[PDB]
Design a protein around this ligand. Structure first.
Ligand SMILES: N[C@@H](CC(=O)O)C(=O)O
Ligand SMILES: N[C@@H](CC(=O)O)C(=O)O
Ligand SMILES: N[C@@H](CC(=O)O)C(=O)O
Length: 302
């Protein structure tokens, strides 16, 4: 596994998030390195899931292509017969660095950020369900009465959040205050379009994507909106097994239930520095491979 990248200053670090290590390539370009780190109950595990970051990078490359005629993205075009390493300083091709970067890294253009977590919900679950049970609203938005847990909304809904800085669920009106009325409306409409297309596809493959979180940027030189993070993975979305879907109850987490159940059984939920046992690592890894193969139609290792 690649847990924490160590590039010895060859590129400056921009950020280390829960999963991605982000480096600055040059004035206009970033390198997004998806590590094998995994979180549960909003803490990072001590150890990693081998090749998780490769699988999730590739899954997202699949979705960018799937959506190529629907939305611009931040990827830098890599010329035919070249690799990312041709676009990086020579030292990063040395074995000690190439091993940390190969297959899990994306070269991306910097863009003007739109500072919103653009969540679209197709189904009522998570924090939305919690709110709804108490007050009959979702992100302050009035909902129909009688929704059951995990039920589909009449139409998928834009339900923005800030970024922590935990994240705060906000209304569309607040999003308009933050980023502008016109821009927020356009972001909302686009995100719902992208979500619906991908949710429908995934459902025919057997996975219900209950919700997903996008991040967008803008081209100030055209007003165009651009995806500025990778999309539609189990880290950015709530995946459920479609065959087992049943309203009125919670769904197993497609990706993380095995891990969550182990943590819960040991009173380790929310605890930092927790090493997952090998059987939990292996099974979680296998579940990422199954997600990847199911959604992309490609084979991981054959
Ligand atoms: N999605 C993770 C959230 C986290 O632990 O950061 C979970 O399934 O519990
Ligand atoms: N590759 C373009 C985006 C696009 O092709 O739509 C860019 O990096 O800005
Ligand atoms: N109509 C918006 C502009 C935007 O789309 O950001 C406003 O100035 O509030």
């Amino acid at each position: 596994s690649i847990t924490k990248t160590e590039l010895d200053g060859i590129l400056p670090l921009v950020a280390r998030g829960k999963v991605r290590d982000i480096y600055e390539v040059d004035a206009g370009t970033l390198l997004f390195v998806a590590t094998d780190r995994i979180s549960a109950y909003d803490v990072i595990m001590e150890n990693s899931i081998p090749e998780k970051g490769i699988l999730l990078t590739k899954l997202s490359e699949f979705w960018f292509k799937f959506l190529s005629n629907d939305v611009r993205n931040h990827l830098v075009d890599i010329a035919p017969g070249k690799t990312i390493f041709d676009y990086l300083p020579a030292k990063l091709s040395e074995p000690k660095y190439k091993t940390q970067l190969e297959d899990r890294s994306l070269l991306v253009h910097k863009h003007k950020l739109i500072p919103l977590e653009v969540i679209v919900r197709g189904y009522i679950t998570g924090s939305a369900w919690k709110e709804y049970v108490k007050t009959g609203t979702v992100h302050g938005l009035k909902q129909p009465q009688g929704l059951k847990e995990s039920q589909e909304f009449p139409e998928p809904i834009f339900t923005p959040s800030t970024k922590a800085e935990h994240d705060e669920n906000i209304s569309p009106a607040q999003a308009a205050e933050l980023v502008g009325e016109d821009l927020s409306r356009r972001v909302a409409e686009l995100a719902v379009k992208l979500y619906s297309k991908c949710k429908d596809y995934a459902k025919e493959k057997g996975i219900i994507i209950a919700d997903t979180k996008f991040e967008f940027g803008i081209d100030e030189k055209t007003n165009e909106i651009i995806l500025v993070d990778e999309v539609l993975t189990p880290d950015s979305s709530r995946f459920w097994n479609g065959a087992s879907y049943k309203v009125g109850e919670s769904q197993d987490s497609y990706d993380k239930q095995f891990l969550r159940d182990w943590l819960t059984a040991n009173k380790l939920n929310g605890v930092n520095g927790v090493k997952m046992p090998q059987d939990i690592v292996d099974r979680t890894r296998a579940k990422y491979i199954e997600a990847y193969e199911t959604l992309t139609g490609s084979k991981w290792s054959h």
